[PDB]
Design a protein around this ligand. Structure first.
Ligand SMILES: [K+]
Ligand SMILES: [K+]
Ligand SMILES: [K+]
Ligand SMILES: [K+]
Ligand SMILES: [K+]
Ligand SMILES: [Mg+2]
Ligand SMILES: [Mg+2]
Ligand SMILES: [Mg+2]
Ligand SMILES: [Mg+2]
Ligand SMILES: [Mg+2]
Ligand SMILES: [Mg+2]
Ligand SMILES: [Mg+2]
Ligand SMILES: [Mg+2]
Ligand SMILES: [Mg+2]
Ligand SMILES: [Mg+2]
Ligand SMILES: [Mg+2]
Ligand SMILES: [Mg+2]
Ligand SMILES: [Mg+2]
Ligand SMILES: [Mg+2]
Ligand SMILES: [Mg+2]
Ligand SMILES: [Mg+2]
Ligand SMILES: [Zn+2]
Lengths: 155, 110, 102, 52, 49, 144, 118
RNA sequence: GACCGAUAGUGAACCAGUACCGUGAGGGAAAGGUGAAAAGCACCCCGGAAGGGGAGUGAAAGAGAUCCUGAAACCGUGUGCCUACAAGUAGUCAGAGCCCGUUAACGGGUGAUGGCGUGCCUUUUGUAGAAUGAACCGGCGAGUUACGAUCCCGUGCAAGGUU
RNA sequence: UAUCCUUGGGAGUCAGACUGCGAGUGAUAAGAUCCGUAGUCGAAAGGGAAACAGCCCAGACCGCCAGCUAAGGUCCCAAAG
RNA sequence: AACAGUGGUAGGAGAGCGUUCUAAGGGCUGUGAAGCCAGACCGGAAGGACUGGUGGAGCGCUUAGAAGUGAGAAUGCCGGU
């Protein structure tokens, strides 16, 4: 703003007599180079919904997955070694074409590394599931162990 | 078939150059030269050199006959201005425009 | 032979084969329209309606249902910050006069 | 006094009609064939009244 | 719901009013503050009560 | 749309003679002005000169009622200070009969370009004879 | 995010200048005077679309009167005669007859004349 | 980075706290873009040179050094219509004639002549106003954000609601 | 005939002008000044009063080369005796 | 469908156009993007297309979101003329 712009202290010219418009500073907002009137200032955009609305949101989104037959439940998901080739083969086996969210019960290092590099394939712990992730990814590959952990919290 | 010559950014005000350009526009090239030689204006020699350049281009690059040529187009466009400042009374300064011209001559057979 | 017929809110002098633009009729392109309100018949045998010529009619063919060239209505009031801009395209029915049944 | 209103492009052009040059009063020099100004000695060949 | 087919609940959101953006908006020029006097000035108006 | 408009191609102009003898200045003038403007023609068109040529004879014999002969004053100003000149109706009719008739009619015509053009079709003459034999002018009687 | 002036300003002003084609001097060249004239033309065009309907009626009446007086009737009496005879031909059509088919007009005029002499 | 993109963003994208201004403290700018690659126009012609016209390079020179794009003001050249008896807020409605041929439309350009008609804005009881503001064009230039209060609306739960 | 009242959210307004009528101040002056009362203007374009915010007629959503009227008019300008 | 209504300053209320950025879908583009320049096209308005010329690499569309979001006036600032 006009206070922060370099310079601009003195009055550009005397108030009367010159025939110019009266001015107070060369950094007034109507001057080229001058301060901005209003404009962006650093602020946070975050706000919080009531807990029950949070739970209702995530439940709504999960139940919607079930209505569209985009919920794939696995007996378990265990990779022998971190290998993107292995993970890509698994997804093709399950007919996973577009994006997919993989939800494991606990931190599964082998799965996280195998899926990290594939575009549109996200890996998440049961704790980490969230509305935006589920809505964004078309398919939801959750493990049986992970389903119970999610149910444990929400139910 | 046209032959063109251009003197760009000649230090001569376009208004002044145009006064002379109007004398030769449309004239036969032989007559035009005699009009420039006998018109006592600053632009005359400048425009004459451009006209002679055009004639040379017509003769050399296009094998046209210099005696059959006519000035089919002749105009002066404004070039960039050199801006200068003359000191006046009471500390005031006044602008001076040292104007330039783009002088173009196109000759062709009649 | 020509006739003066009232159609729209207006009167038109018509001859057979003439193409006339009139106010929009409830009629599809190609359909045959009849004008029952004939006020006057000219040419050789001159019928004068009072107000209409009894029994006379003019049949004609709907050529096109269209809208006229657009006019932009713009009105303002000086010094009172009052502007109003409004487009208009008046519907019309293009008709070709087939027969004047006097 | 200062201009009360700017001059239009039309009024400017109408004024400058008479602001014109004339073609010079030329006549061929019968000696050398160059064009000189009538009644002036020929610059090119130096001739006048048929004398150099 | 789809990220490309989001719809807010009807009447849950309204567009802000931007004053001083031309005559046709209805808050052009004086931006709703009438003409002159203390109430029309920037940071104008008297203290509460 | 449809309303036909006269134009220079369509117009045919008659020549009419009007005898001023015994006629009232203003009442003759108003009817002559109608003829000059073409109001008597069903093809009258406002932006074209559709009127006929009028010849006025015996201008010197125009009449005025009341005391207008002595009291009606024709003013003009020369655009010089105190340059207001005047003439009585008597003097005008005696010495400028054509001017008197022309003034009355010119005042009753439109004032702009076409109105001045219409006036060019008027011809006012002092005596009973006019030089326009060749135009074959018809006698025109005033309609009251 | 910052919104630059961009191309919106030039587009809007060009539209107005295009509407000002054929205006004298600056009025077809400079936006402000062009904009004023285009606005002024709007008011004039509205006014004259309503004046058109008076000018043509005025023209028709003048023509009918001329043609009527060729049948020894003033316009006043002719129109009264037609009303008494129940003739609903309007002045646009009467004027058309007067100009294009004078014999037809005389027939209507004679009808009026009959009613007046009654 | 739901920050700026060369009048923006640092005063300073560039030899900027420089140039310039001031005795001094101090104030304080303007100014980015050839091409992928200099392959940066050998040679010829006019010219003292500048600047051109060819020829070559290149995809392009109408990319040739203030070298991407190149708007408006403004300045010109050519001409389809009109213009030297005319009183003009310059247009609008009517309208021949002449000249064109489109996003194909009850088309385009010009406009003899007729009717009507005293700019825009601000401020005023009232302004064409001889009251104020604007030479013109372009860009920039003014109810925003934070935190509280209250009301309407939407949603969740409800004698509970919420961290 | 279709307004009215309560509650709540947001205002702007506190320079008014003239015309008719009833009064004051003035000189039974003022386009003066101050009230009452109605209207128009303000914030109202159109028609008439030559031009003419306030007077007469009358309230513009928009198109029409249709018709009937208001005030005011109908010899010419300029529609209509 | 019927009926009725639709002048407007201060001001209140509603519905929209357009600009920059983000998300998600779906596209366009060296067979030529944005910008610029024309045109006699389209919509009730803000406005939107189509075609051709220039340009030489980025840009729309749909839904939603966020704003340095719209200029003709400030003896406005700067540049050009
Ligand atoms: K006030
Ligand atoms: K730039
Ligand atoms: K400006
Ligand atoms: K007011
Ligand atoms: K192209
Ligand atoms: Mg400071
Ligand atoms: Mg000194
Ligand atoms: Mg308002
Ligand atoms: Mg103010
Ligand atoms: Mg801007
Ligand atoms: Mg900067
Ligand atoms: Mg490039
Ligand atoms: Mg005052
Ligand atoms: Mg003031
Ligand atoms: Mg001034
Ligand atoms: Mg008073
Ligand atoms: Mg007013
Ligand atoms: Mg109304
Ligand atoms: Mg009547
Ligand atoms: Mg009359
Ligand atoms: Mg802004
Ligand atoms: Zn010699």
């Amino acid at each position: 703003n006009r206070s922060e712009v370099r310079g601009g202290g003195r009055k550009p010219w005397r108030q009367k007599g010159t025939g110019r418009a009266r001015q107070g500073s060369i950094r007034s907002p109507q001057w080229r180079g001058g301060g901005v009137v209003f404009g962006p200032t650093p602020r946070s955009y975050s706000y919080k919904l009531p807990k029950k609305v949070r739970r209702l949101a995530i439940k709504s989104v999960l139940s919607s997955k079930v209505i569209d037959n985009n919920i794939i439940v696995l007996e378990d998901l265990t990779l022998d070694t971190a290998k993107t080739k292995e993970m890509a083969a698994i997804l093709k086996g399950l007919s996973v074409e577009k994006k997919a969210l993989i939800v494991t019960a606990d931190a599964n290092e082998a799965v996280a590394l195998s899926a990290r590099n594939i575009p549109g394939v996200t890996v998440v712990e049961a704790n980490g599931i969230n509305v935006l992730d589920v809505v964004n990814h078309e398919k939801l590959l959750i493990t049986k162990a992970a389903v119970e952990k999610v149910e444990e919290v929400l139910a | 078939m046209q032959a063109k010559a251009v003197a760009r950014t000649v230090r001569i005000a376009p208004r002044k150059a145009r006064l002379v350009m109007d004398l030769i526009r449309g004239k036969q090239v032989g007559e035009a030269v005699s009009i420039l030689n006998l018109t006592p204006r600053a632009a005359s020699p400048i425009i004459e050199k451009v006209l002679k350049s055009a004639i040379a281009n017509a003769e050399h690059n296009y094998e046209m006959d210099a005696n059959n040529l006519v000035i089919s187009q002749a105009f002066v466009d404004e070039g960039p201005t050199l801006k200068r400042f003359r000191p006046r009374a009471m500390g005031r300064a006044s602008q001076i425009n040292k104007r330039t011209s783009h002088i173009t001559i196109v000759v062709s057979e009649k | 032979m020509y006739a003066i017929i009232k159609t729209g809110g207006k009167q038109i002098k018509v001859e057979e084969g003439q193409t006339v633009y009139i106010e929009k009729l409830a009629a599809e392109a190609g359909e045959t329209v009849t004008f029952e309100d004939v006020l006057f018949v000219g040419g050789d045998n001159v019928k004068v309606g009072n107000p209409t010529v009894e029994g006379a009619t003019v049949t004609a063919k709907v050529e096109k249902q269209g809208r006229a060239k657009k006019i932009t209505v713009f009105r303002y009031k000086p010094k009172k910050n009052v502007h109003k801009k409004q487009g208009h395209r008046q519907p019309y029915t293009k008709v070709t006069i087939e027969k004047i049944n006097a | 006094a200062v201009p009360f209103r700017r001059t239009s492009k039309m009024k400017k052009r109408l004024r400058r009609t008479h602001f014109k040059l004339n073609v010079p009063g030329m006549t061929e020099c019968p000696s050398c064939g160059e064009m000189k100004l009538s009644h002036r000695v020929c610059k090119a060949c130096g001739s006048y009244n048929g004398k150099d | 719901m789809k990220l490309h087919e989001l719809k807010p609940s009807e009447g849950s959101r309204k567009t802000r009013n931007r004053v001083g953006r031309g005559i046709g908006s209805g808050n052009g020029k004086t931006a709703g503050k009438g003409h002159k006097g203390q109430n029309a000035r920037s940071g104008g108006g008297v203290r509460p009560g | 749309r449809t309303t036909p408009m006269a134009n220079a191609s369509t117009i045919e102009r008659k020549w009419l003679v009007v005898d001023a003898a015994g006629k009232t200045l203003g009442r003759l003038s108003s009817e002559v002005a109608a003829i000059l403007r073409g109001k008597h023609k069903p093809t009258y068109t406002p932006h074209v000169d559709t009127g006929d040529h009028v010849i006025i004879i015996n201008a010197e014999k125009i009449e005025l009622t009341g005391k207008k002969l002595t009291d009606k004053i024709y003013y003009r100003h020369t655009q010089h200070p105190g340059g207001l000149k005047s003439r009585t109706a008597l003097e005008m009719r005696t010495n400028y009969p054509e001017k008197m008739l022309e003034l009355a009619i010119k005042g009753m015509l439109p004032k702009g370009s076409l109105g001045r053009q219409m006036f060019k079709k008027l011809n006012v003459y002092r005596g009973s004879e006019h030089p326009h034999e060749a135009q074959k002018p018809e006698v025109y009687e005033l309609r009251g | 995010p910052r919104v630059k002036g961009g191309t919106v300003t030039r587009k809007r002003r060009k539209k107005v200048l295009k509407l000002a084609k054929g205006y004298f001097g600056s009025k077809h060249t400079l936006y402000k005077v062009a904009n004023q004239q285009v606005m002024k033309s709007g008011n004039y065009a509205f006014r004259d679309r309503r004046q058109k309907k008076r000018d043509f009626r005025k023209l028709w009446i003048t023509r009918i009167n001329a043609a009527a007086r060729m049948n020894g009737l003033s316009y006043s009496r002719l129109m009264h005669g037609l009303k008494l005879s129940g003739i609903e031909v309007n002045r646009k059509m009467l004027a058309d007859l007067a100009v294009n088919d004078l014999t037809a007009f005389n027939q209507l005029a004679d009808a009026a004349k009959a009613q007046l002499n009654k």
